[model samples]
Target chain A: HHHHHHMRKIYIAGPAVFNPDMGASYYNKVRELLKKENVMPLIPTDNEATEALDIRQKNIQMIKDCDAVIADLSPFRGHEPDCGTAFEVGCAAALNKMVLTFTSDRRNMREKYGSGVDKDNLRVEGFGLPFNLMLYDGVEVFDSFESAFKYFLANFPS
Target chain B: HHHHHHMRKIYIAGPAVFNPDMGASYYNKVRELLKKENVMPLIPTDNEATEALDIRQKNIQMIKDCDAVIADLSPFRGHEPDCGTAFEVGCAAALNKMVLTFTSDRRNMREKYGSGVDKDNLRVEGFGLPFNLMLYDGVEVFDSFESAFKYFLANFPS
Candidate 1:
């Protein structure tokens, strides 16, 4: 029975909230986009300010409660998604939740490290994928927020 | 509480199975390490007989059943751990499980990413930290298997 409770809730995982203002604005934009596509968006800022552990718990619960996850897999501080965002994607996927990864950055893993070896003669292994293969395996990579939202609308078609 | 649970089970996450023979031997080494420290190790390879969904479910259950997780962040298939291993680390961290990452690769991020800036002259966001802040935050990184195992023994002593 292929159920169609499609696009109920989607978690937005990203480093957009490196600070409060940017975080809020980014979430609002994504939330509006998800709402337009008939999906509710869940984010860390949605929760109240409580204990650190409490907020973490709420975030985990939010991921569990989400219908699917849309992660901003753009390289965060370095060559990967924000560690927390990566974890959220992992949690959602382990629950068999569908994930759509969006990367504003155009370069794949290969371009991130050129020549396949470091200056010190150390080997550099770049799989030339969007991110790590396991992370992007079942998850499709979208070029932009608009593209991802469009894909979601088509798939769920609420 | 005294942080000693002698028989606590720990999940192993890595690309140990990327090369069948090497994977088996690597796991055997880790298992021996855990046993010597009085801890029980739970590995996905222990139940490789199952197929797709079953294996996923089993590994997730394994993480849930274990006391913590030990992931080999050694680059696999490319410049990242097997996506599955990355997901497992995230799953355990989301569940607030103790996470300790071990990477055999000696070169750090700067060495991996060439001069900390690309041809575009953008500052490479390496905060002099090992790995991403989110993935490595609250999680200790060990230089080698022996050091990690030693750290585990000292902190979570039998």
Candidate 2:
């Protein structure tokens, strides 16, 4: 609630924040990427010094305060986006906040899940989309963060 | 806003809704399991006859009308639940509704993401939680849906 409203704030939701080699480096890059557009990126690691406050609270507060949420819905630990990021995206969308997503994994539903229902009685929806029917319905998804940032700059109102 | 005042509705959220084995059949099994609890289970297929209405609208309305959400977070096409399910859980949680998640997959998260993170300097928070930190915050997760249902019956008011 104390944050100034002049700058368009976007929350970065993804698993890259936990990457060992480039976790912090990636976060910093995202900050610079968004800053170039005169927009502020609200990363989870932005403030690491406040040990007294809970990190989860910080994430939710940032999501609530931000203008929109940009999530990395690509496969993380296994075949899904970071579970934490998925939750944050849901929160943002439920609040009627604009959601823009990115995924480095390019394979679509059919490509991965097979042409149709398998012997296991499991079938892919074959929606020809990056994520799921819900996420693909109205929100925009990009193949890379760079592409999403580009789209955000052109569409989001500061 | 938590209208659990005799709130006995449970919205089933998961990718199994798309299973070719007849998702309705699965939902019915869940209902049978909880039949004695005096609570009712609501599945998206509740409107199976109403194909005229938008399915997405129907599901969202169901979530809002329900008291709590029980999501099957088992991996779907890739490594996550149906993205739609993820989004719905987020919506329910944001609305201050109780969310109980379950993963049919027996493998713990560490067994799945253990060495996976070592190479990338990425590591799971290492709490041995089933899913992500955000979900562990206010939500209760179970290794099996039966366990969650049992807990639900014992704890949820009749």
Candidate 3:
């Protein structure tokens, strides 16, 4: 029954490609995971465009082509997801594609980063949400990719 | 002649909301600017919701109701725009709304942040774009809100 949907393609969005310690290994693991679930994983790293605009066009086209997007929403430089990843997630949501995300840190923004204000005296958001309101509101968030993919399998099985 | 479109609303997105010294003052200036152009401005800070979910919903609704979005893409904590602003930019793009952005720093990522890699060895994008590729592509960018809004008037004039 689920064989028909096994061909679905999911665009993987995250900072994983920039990860010096586990870039290729991490993607490899995710590739295997998606393959086991019978869905094609579209990784941006697979794009070989050396030019900037070309890379952007290719990635946008990939999002347009995929059935869904599973993003890694883990914090990057600060307490926020990689800006590029956030943009991709928004693109997926705008395309009306199913969007799922995972974060290694499950605590809400304040809890993880604390309620202290920054150098500018701007305080962390007190919304008790794990990420920014716009990013987390309409999307399904899981603690890790494994769990998010599991939910994807259960809900989107065709 | 353009009075018929006077009611068009543009949702303002950026890090100005967290500006410790100039938060309200900045929004006031932007609001005046939009009003003078005969279009309404939707500021996220106008939402008074105390809960995280409610705040998110209100802002999303505002984006849905707007005719366009004008975001401040100035670098936030590091080299990227505020994550929240990026998310809204994506939302507006996804909704097929006209999206315009402004950045105080006109230099490309590499020029401003340098070609140095992070602790994770992730290098700043070298795409000759002032921001992330996903962000700069398909969207109009200006050095300041005044210029972006001016372009909006010329192109989107009703």
Candidate 4:
């Protein structure tokens, strides 16, 4: 129950790369990062699709191949935990495969010596500004990678 | 530049107020914390905007009259620092108003746990995520309101 006999691949999910380095395509940093770790990171490099067949076969196959998954929470124009990451994570969870997720919020970082807000609590009946900040969970949290990394490194089923 | 006398009244920003009483209502918790620290907090009220036009404008005006701003970065589906918090932070920065911010990563407080690939990398992203993380003078950093608050309170302009 605690062994990784499989490919032990790392599947990174984030924005579709549009990196200038890749001729306007993204760098797929997650894969690049995992590759450095000597881990095979699976992210489909092909985009050609036939709606029905592509959705069920190609997509699912790439995901099934990963023993664990890592997600990029960093911001890219089209990157914000898109449908692909969602599916990948969900699938990983269902398969009981190990899964890891991370996001970058530097843009929203609070400013002091440097910034942060006010908005009316909008929790009502057809609306403008529709966030249930008052009704839904409004907990604000912050963390550091060193802490996150160390913690997971110690506890994740390696 | 060590006093708040010239500082404008500011509001506390969070996702929402669900319980309006206990653990769920961090809005109130933040206000209490600010008060304990002898700070002026603009605590906003929850109004159902399900049927109003420009309903959040009322709160926006409260933000407009402020000379400084403070916000929380602990984010999720409802606690996202998207349009609402973004606007307030934008306004404060535009007016050059001093801003403050905070977060408590539940991860650090509890037993560290993780899934696959790089759960350790997950913590590196921070509570509000990496993209939301910020820096003031050339150091990698966290996106906590407490840090920003300390920095601002320590160096507020007189």
Candidate 5:
């Protein structure tokens, strides 16, 4: 059930934006890659809003506007993906947009964090998934953006 | 701009489910509190689905079936809220559901994580918000579940 359309707009979500260079170099690479496929990549940092609230509203709108969301679900400060990126993934999924994700580590939560309780004695999920079950389900996890993007183009052609 | 309706259903989202007792005690307290307010609380852990994918699907459906989402956005394993909880927040927000959140720590991200780059030298967002700008923008972050629930009752009355 595929349909022809205009250039697909994909929202890029991840901790890459938190890079020391503000993801300038990383997003530049992403921009070039997506453009090559005739896809328009929407970067969160592209929002010029300076205030916190304004930035939030704009990013949410971007998710709504985009046809798909390609996220980096790699572990950030700890065992899970960036909280902000996870939020974006949920937003896109709820909106019925195609959601594709990539992780550098590619290790399941248990494999990475271990099989028992954490420092707080809370049970770490033993679900054999790359991350939280909710975040892992309904989305395909690729090893890199290139692969995920390629899958998107092939399956969800525009 | 208020309208009368039946009992409000609120999906409880948080890391409380990861508690030592699998949030049995924590959720019991939450259930009692919400029932006292005549609101039906939807707990993610209530899903009897044993498999990881089934659990994820059930939780997402619960979010869709609820009128609002009351989440505990307190820092989980590190300085940010649980990635799963953050994802639920985004889902509720995108679905136009009332998204309310609470945090044990009232300090902004900068205050909690400090005003500089993190260990990886990534520039921590200095947005003066409790969490990520995207997650913090559309929702109200209260000091406790009691306070957030009260605010929801008053502002988004059923």
Candidate 6:
């Protein structure tokens, strides 16, 4: 092989990243991409999310040991960063490490977001992040990996 | 009032559209925005989500009753609108409805989205209409909803 095995790893995290269908089509499709690049994707062992602290800790350790993370925040759940994928992205983001996110079909969907968020939810966006559409510059709305991967691949660990 | 209302009604056809915090927080924030100008949103009854035929009828009714629809796209919450969101959005788009949409936090955040989207027809330009960034985007993103609201308010049919 290549002497040192590239020295970089990609950790793909999400809520049941392989839930048969949820992100399965995409994940499986991307497996080819990952395989092409020869990167081992650190997916969760058990599909059902673990509520046990120790198991969660193991996930954390897995994240800590990875060189980078690719989170799927396609709004499958919510944006509190706790829904597995969000948690992975948030941890990677907070650590100032390489954090990559992806979404399909749905991008900017939230009920209350921004500092001016209100409980009334009169006429605002749905389940949004702290910023409006300005945070990741609408990264979730992208259609294909070719459209936005180069930019993230460059900035993530650059 | 304003021409912004010309976009589409988007009869947020999902459970608890009225209660943003309970479902998608982004929808709740959107509720807040409307509340700011005193706009009453039309929420759909999730009753049909239970029955296949009922959901089909409701999907049709929802599409016909409202100018467009902003779905939650949550998967398999007892066979809710996870796949249905896209399907309904497709219906609206096929019928020439506005079809704006946003989902939970998990799906909205991903890595390749930056370079993945279609870039041409996709509205990933920052949650103008279909792409609601309530929780996906950050604080500074909400900087001047004057135009955003103006577009939404001015175009209201009422």
Best by TM-score: 5
Model 4 / residue B60 / CA error / Å: 2.7
Residue A29, candidate 5: C-alpha displacement in angstroms? 1.1
Q: Once superposed on the true structure, which residue ranges of model 3 sit more than 4 Å away at CA?
A: A1-6, A138-140, B1-6, B138-140
TM-score of each model, in listed order: 0.62, 0.80, 0.89, 0.37, 0.94, 0.38
TM-score of 2: 0.80
Candidate that would win on lDDT? 5
Q: Which stretches of candidate 4 lie over 4 Å from their true place?
A: A1-158, B1-8, B18-25, B36-38, B46-53, B78-83, B106-129, B133-148
Taking candidate 2, what TM-score does its chain B reach relative to the real chain B? 0.77
> For model 6 chain B, where is the 10-residue window of minimal lDDT?
B133-142
Alpha-carbon deviation at A140 in model 2, angstroms? 3.1
lDDT of each: 0.67, 0.71, 0.79, 0.41, 0.85, 0.43
Question: How far out, in Å, is residue A86 in model 6?
Answer: 1.6
Give the CA lDDT, 0 to 100, for residue B78 in model 5.
85
Winner by DockQ: 5
Worst 10 residues of 2 chain B by lDDT: B47-56
Candidate 6's displacement at residue A47, Å, is 10
Off by over 4 Å in 1: A1-7, A118-126, B1-9, B13-32, B35-67, B71-86, B93-158
DockQ of each: 0.21, 0.47, 0.64, 0.02, 0.78, 0.03
User: lDDT of model 1 at residue B57?
Assistant: 64
lDDT of 5 by residue, B41-76 (tens): 899988468898788778889899998888898989
Error of 2 at A141 (Å): 2.3
**Cα lDDT tens digits for candidate 1, A29-69:** 88777776578888876855544445556777888888667
lDDT of 2 by residue, A8-120 (tens): 89998888877774467777888788878788889887675333226666787888898888888887644446667877887886787878888887677666555665445
Encode model 3's per-residue lDDT on B75-153: one tens digit a residue.
Answer: 8877788888887887777787888999988787878866656555677776668887778755557988898888778
B81-112, model 4: which lDDT tens digit per residue? 33244334433443445556544442321132
- Sort the predicted structures by lDDT, highest score first: 5, 3, 2, 1, 6, 4
lDDT of 5 at A137: 58
**Cα-lDDT of candidate 2:** 0.71
Q: Deviation in angstroms for A84 in model 6?
A: 2.1
User: Comparing 2 and 4 by TM-score, which wins?
Assistant: 2
lDDT of 5 at B82: 92
